[PDB]
Write a protein that binds this ligand. Structure first.
Ligand SMILES: Nc1ncnc2c1ncn2[C@@H]1O[C@H](COP(=O)(O)OP(=O)(O)OC[C@H]2O[C@H](O)[C@H](O)[C@@H]2O)[C@@H](O)[C@H]1O
Ligand SMILES: Nc1ncnc2c1ncn2[C@@H]1O[C@H](COP(=O)(O)OP(=O)(O)OC[C@H]2O[C@H](O)[C@H](O)[C@@H]2O)[C@@H](O)[C@H]1O
Ligand SMILES: Nc1ncnc2c1ncn2[C@@H]1O[C@H](COP(=O)(O)OP(=O)(O)OC[C@H]2O[C@H](O)[C@H](O)[C@@H]2O)[C@@H](O)[C@H]1O
Ligand SMILES: Nc1ncnc2c1ncn2[C@@H]1O[C@H](COP(=O)(O)OP(=O)(O)OC[C@H]2O[C@H](O)[C@H](O)[C@@H]2O)[C@@H](O)[C@H]1O
Lengths: 401, 83, 398, 401, 400
């Protein structure tokens, strides 16, 4: 259902708490991989199946010799991937260091497969990834409503809205190019496009006396970004990328040697050369720790230490509000009372059980999804009625009926 | 327990214009006098010397005026060097 | 015979230091029992030097049987008379509790004979203690000047003086009722007068230089506890009639939990509450910025007041002035392996690299009536008696 | 039964009074030993039964040979402990001077066993005192609600809360190390912890253009404090203590020395060495002497002469309000009408029989306990709905019927 | 030997530069392992010598079979000891799952030997490690001067000082606890002390009557940090650690627990333990990339690639200034100009030769040490260089 302060509240008060919440001077959203299922995307549960359905032999070694997975988990499809990768990357260093040439070649294929199945699930359109005007179809519609609503609810003087995302897909840009709105992502240029971190401090303005713009922060990168040195990162278009490297990976049986820039692991600090991750999380921190702040969270399954460890430390400021959508809120209050349960549901039942009115939690199956989320945000009122006569006139009329 | 200074204070700056410094005072202090390990010193009359602690040095100034804004007192001074 | 900072001074450079000290934010004074010998009082030697003479048959039990005093101290006349009374008061309660009928009547005599030498000496007059208008006389002439100078040397906005003492006599109240000055002391009311420990936080003002504060650390003759559980103040005439004309001229001590001098019944949770709130204020006045304290009449034979003063020089805004008229002998005695704790204590700080301290000696040059004359009158103060020639012309109109 | 000003008052007015009391500048809470019964704590009537059951041979001498307690008072369990701990030292001090070496042993044996029983009554969890994370259990939730509410209902600009207690236990620390709130208690350091009385004048601040906190005053000491007599007070955690100077006290059957500093007696000034005892009562008064001040009292039996003199003297100021909870009030009202009654009943009914509307007493038995005192407190409203616009249209609902 | 941009300087042009540099907005310090030799510590090669004296049997299974080290470096005493324990932990973790019992004992037995040898060298006081008031002893006399001088010269509206360090010992804490200063290190609590990274952004403030506090970043860890359950990291006191684990380490033999210790950079593959190491470098960069910044270095050998990368990248910003102390310029210039020396020498030399007025290097053997770095820093005016405190405390304690 809907909980606040550890207690229960009703629909007609949530519908107005939202309204009163979208009038503050700092508003943001954080999306995950579920928000992209209505457009062609996939979840991590739908990747293990596609791995064990097209690479059946390697799986045998993973279960028999190296002893990394259990048959029960594979059969029941309850196996993680962002933790398997970090172990397949550990069994490899201590083999390259002790010079065993029969395991390097057996561990260099598994990672390529896990990186190919993670890539085929972020295109959203298959072969039509390189064409143009893909933000005109009937799928990228609520992604347009979201931006329109976020931007039309700002009075002058206030700051622009922010968006935070993990997934690599391009569903937020396709829907803003079709709409006439310029997002900011850090880079600048066309013939050589390059990251300068002081581009997050710019802002439009007009000659005499447009105002429609927003900021986009991707925390785990994209599949249009590449690296060539230790001081530069470049971006190309989609047709260009699909010709250069994204086609070989999909079709040829090569080993992934660092063509594109993604962090799908569990410990993302082992990457001792990445300097974008830090500049993104620094801005996330700087934003979450200022007064009169509101945040919406959707699509996130609560399996990231680094983010569950930031959301807790911001609830010690008495001007910060969150709203959280989680369908399976009942099957997690069930399991965690009788001892069992993973950390994912522990983390969110901990939040459900609190005594501060600055936390709200929504459940209820298919009414906590993205399409329902959007329809709970309000359109503004252009000409605000003082409405004294509006209600006065009907107040008198009642009795004569 | 850190002994950053072996000396009590007299007030705090609130203004800076050109080369004339404006100072406000504390509350209990009326009778021209302050105390320290060596004895007693007069601090309020025109023609007297006053010191400001500025990091690793000491700025020296001379008093000129004295006025009201238990009301609020105010002082004016001019710098003549540093130690 | 005037030592500041370890080295010497002269009269003028010190009389110019005094004047600058009295102009600080907080000013105070601590007095002792030697300040009231110019009015009819007696020091603490002369009391034992007479108890010894008048009651020898009790001086053996205290040493050979109960071990409450030592022989060399009693022979050199160096005993503390407050702690003896406290211990003898605490020895009687145990016996009264566990029903021993010999040790109960053996101590009543001791206590009756001890409460009879300190009372007779705290009456500065005699049978004129019950009468009225006693501060009009000649003995109380410098006590007045002290207060006058302490009050008239302040400015508008500056706080009022404080006074602490160890005597249990009525020499500063008589001498203030005459000037026309009001002293706060904690008590309020007339028909039922009671101790409220917040009246030290009050002050006067007009709606169309009136008051000061007094702290008595060891009690007074007019304080007592009734069959109730509350402390009550009364006047001298009433006390003479209730519980002071029997002490001397009879042999009566059966109210053993009744009197509040000179620091005796501190095992009752109701009588210690009034002693504590005075040291708790001494140790809070003596810890402020821009403070000055003058001492006089006090022999440094108390451990806690010394452990409280010594720990206040650690702030660079507290200054002390001390009068001790037997400083030569002490330096002599502690030069070559000798001396008592008081002399060692004073000599300890007489030698210091501290400009906050100043010591004064010279016998009759460190007495109360010279302490006073070292304090200044203002230049616009009325002194000539120009109103007294006119109060008798109104009497001639009989 | 609720009496304001000696008159009678009802619940839906009491509850509106509390709301407006909790919006003043200065607010405070004084607690006692009854606030720690829902966690494993005992009372002074139970300490006596335990000392009666064990050690039955000293009680003999105590009644017959020394005339120090009465048979009736013993049986009926009405005896005071603080007025016995304050005579078993007088009887000693006299013998230390008379040199009665045998009399100088019974009283040590008695005081040791009297100090050993109030020590194992502040170990709320008996043998799990040394373990970690003791504030996660179920017996500590009404201690978290209190702090949460007190901190929540504060505005930007208004000072922080203070908490006064007389107990020795560690509940309010176990129940804050969980939330992540930082209480100030006057100590500093980890490897060598020391008491300075100027840490009561500090606050927090974010270093831009976790600022929750509160102040805690223990008036009688703690189990984690000790003194080496060098005039320095050292604090320690709850495992070092158990390992070094508590297991002995309990089991080793030794004599007593000043291992840790507690003031359980009746006259706290007799201790002419205690100087930390005097910096707490110098703040209690400085607090209640301010304007716009409210105090809530719970768990206190009104048997402290030095405490029940300050509250009387603070009631001559027109901006100080106090609320009191006393379960067994009818019996006192009758026992004083019959010319009898103890010194605490004579005080509570004298506070109840006033004519000022700044005193409020709350009886009713179980309706005056610590779990109800907390539900009486309010949660705040963040977006104040004036609903003056709503009045117009919700007024007409009654018309239809 | 002092060089600025290749050209030389004199002491009086140098002391007039340090003062101008210390008046800037942001100030910082980066120390190393040599700074702790005037107190009872050791150096990384004096560690390897003692290792290969006492344990020469395990030194063959480490060069022949598993390829973990090289003979040239083992002979010239140029081994990294904080980079080998991590790899050995990786090996052991792999063997646990692969279930090869013939290989877990041979790694337990050679980790118990490395920890026993790195721990013993960081107590600084031996068996007097579990006692109290270890900052009064005279060995810790300049660590106090450093702190006091860094604080005593700042003005209102100016950020507080930060102190980064690679050591894993308790000297700065023992010193601040005796000065009466507060250091923030990311922890909070006493009965359960936990890591909160959001409180490197906090500060103090006074109500009516404050700015005595500093920030400390430790890049490799500490002996007082450990892990008990999956999700949290705890801190304890010296007397408590010594009794829990630090004692068996020394005395008992064949004692090794597992992934329980957080020193030095060892169990870096979990996700609860590397989160602690990464934040430090994060904050290091975020500090070293501000405007109007100055950095002093002392005790660092320049054997790390990432820190040198960070510094060289930072030097693009014209408002960053540095100062370095390396007492082997002469013994390295030749060894690198003839045929080549070692990466450390090459790196440190590349900086001497540039057209920069915002770089500086210092040599002279015993003239570029810690007891001399602490003396080039200006000393304030009002700060009292006299002690009439102890003469009063002595009398207070003598009173009786
Ligand atoms: N139509 C829908 N609308 C909204 N939510 C949905 C929908 N369908 C499913 N869900 C919810 O989507 C949730 C499953 O989302 P997950 O597979 O965890 O996406 P991830 O991106 O977290 O996974 C990778 C993480 O790993 C790294 O650590 C990063 O932190 C990443 O977050 C379920 O709760 C569904 O109820
Ligand atoms: N006319 C005079 N003027 C000034 N001082 C004088 C005069 N005559 C003597 N003196 C000095 O007055 C001093 C008399 O010292 P004493 O009366 O024994 O000590 P106390 O009054 O503090 O006794 C009360 C204490 O007893 C308990 O122990 C408590 O601790 C109390 O504090 C000598 O030094 C003389 O030089
Ligand atoms: N569950 C409960 N909730 C609330 N109150 C309760 C509960 N159970 C009992 N009570 C009440 O809790 C009260 C307990 O009264 P007592 O134990 O005699 O008083 P003290 O604990 O302060 O005594 C110790 C102090 O007394 C000296 O002053 C020293 O300062 C000592 O520190 C009763 O009124 C019960 O009705
Ligand atoms: N008294 C002294 N004062 C100043 N410097 C000294 C002194 N004594 C020796 N030195 C200098 O101190 C230096 C000792 O260098 P080392 O202790 O091996 O290096 P580290 O402690 O940084 O090793 C840790 C790093 O190793 C890995 O790369 C990790 O990345 C770590 O960052 C010599 O140059 C001496 O000239």
């Amino acid at each position: 259902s809907i909980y606040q302060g550890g207690n229960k509240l009703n629909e007609d008060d949530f519908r107005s708490h939202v309204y009163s919440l979208c009038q503050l001077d700092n508003v943001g959203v954080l999306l995950g991989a579920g928000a992209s299922v209505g457009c062609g995307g996939k979840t991590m549960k739908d990747v293990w199946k596609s791995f064990k359905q097209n690479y059946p032999e390697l799986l045998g070694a993973l279960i028999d010799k190296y002893l990394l997975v259990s048959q029960i988990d594979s059969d029941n499809n309850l196996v993680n991937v962002e933790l398997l990768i970090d172990e397949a990357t550990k069994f490899l260093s201590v083999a390259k260091t002790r010079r065993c040439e029969d395991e390097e070649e057996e561990f260099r294929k598994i990672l390529s497969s896990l990186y190919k199945e993670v890539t085929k699930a972020a295109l959203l359109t298959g072969e039509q990834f390189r064409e143009k005007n893909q933000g005109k179809k009937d799928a990228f519609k609520y992604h347009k409503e979201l931006i329109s609503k976020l931007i039309s609810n700002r009075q002058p003087g206030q700051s622009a809205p922010a968006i935070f995302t993990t997934n690599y897909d391009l569903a937020l840009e396709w829907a803003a190019e079709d709409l006439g709105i310029q997002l900011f992502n850090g880079f600048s240029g066309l013939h050589t496009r390059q990251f300068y971190p002081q581009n997050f401090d710019l802002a439009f303005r007009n000659v005499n006396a447009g105002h429609y713009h927003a900021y986009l922060y991707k925390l785990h990168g994209s599949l249009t970004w590449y690296q060539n040195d230790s001081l530069t990162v470049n971006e190309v278009s989609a047709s260009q990328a699909y010709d250069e490297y994204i086609n070989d990976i999909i079709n040829k049986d090569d080993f992934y040697r660092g063509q594109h820039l993604i962090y799908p692991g569990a410990n993302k600090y082992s990457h001792t050369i990445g300097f974008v991750y830090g500049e993104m999380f620094r801005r996330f921190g700087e934003f979450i720790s200022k007064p009169q702040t509101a945040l919406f969270i959707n699509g996130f399954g609560f399996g990231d230490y680094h983010i569950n460890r930031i959301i807790l430390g911001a609830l010690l400021n008495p001007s910060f509000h969150v709203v959280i959508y989680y369908p399976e809120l009942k099957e997690a209050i069930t399991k965690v009372s009788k001892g069992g349960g993973s950390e994912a549901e522990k983390a969110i039942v901990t939040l459900k059980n609190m005594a501060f009115n600055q936390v709200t939690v929504v459940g209820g199956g298919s009414k906590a999804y993205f399409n329902s989320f959007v329809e709970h945000l309000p359109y503004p009122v252009l000409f605000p009625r003082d409405n004294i006569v509006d209600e006065l006139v009907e107040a008198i009329a009642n009795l004569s009926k | 327990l850190f002994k950053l200074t072996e000396i009590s204070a007299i007030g705090y700056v609130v203004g800076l214009e050109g080369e004339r410094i404006r100072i406000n005072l504390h509350e209990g202090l009326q009778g021209r006098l302050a105390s320290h390990r060596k004895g007693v010193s007069s601090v309020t009359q025109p023609g007297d010397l006053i010191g400001f602690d500025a990091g690793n040095i000491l700025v020296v100034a001379r008093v000129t005026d004295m006025a009201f804004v238990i009301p609020l007192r105010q002082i004016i001074a001019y710098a003549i060097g540093f130690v």
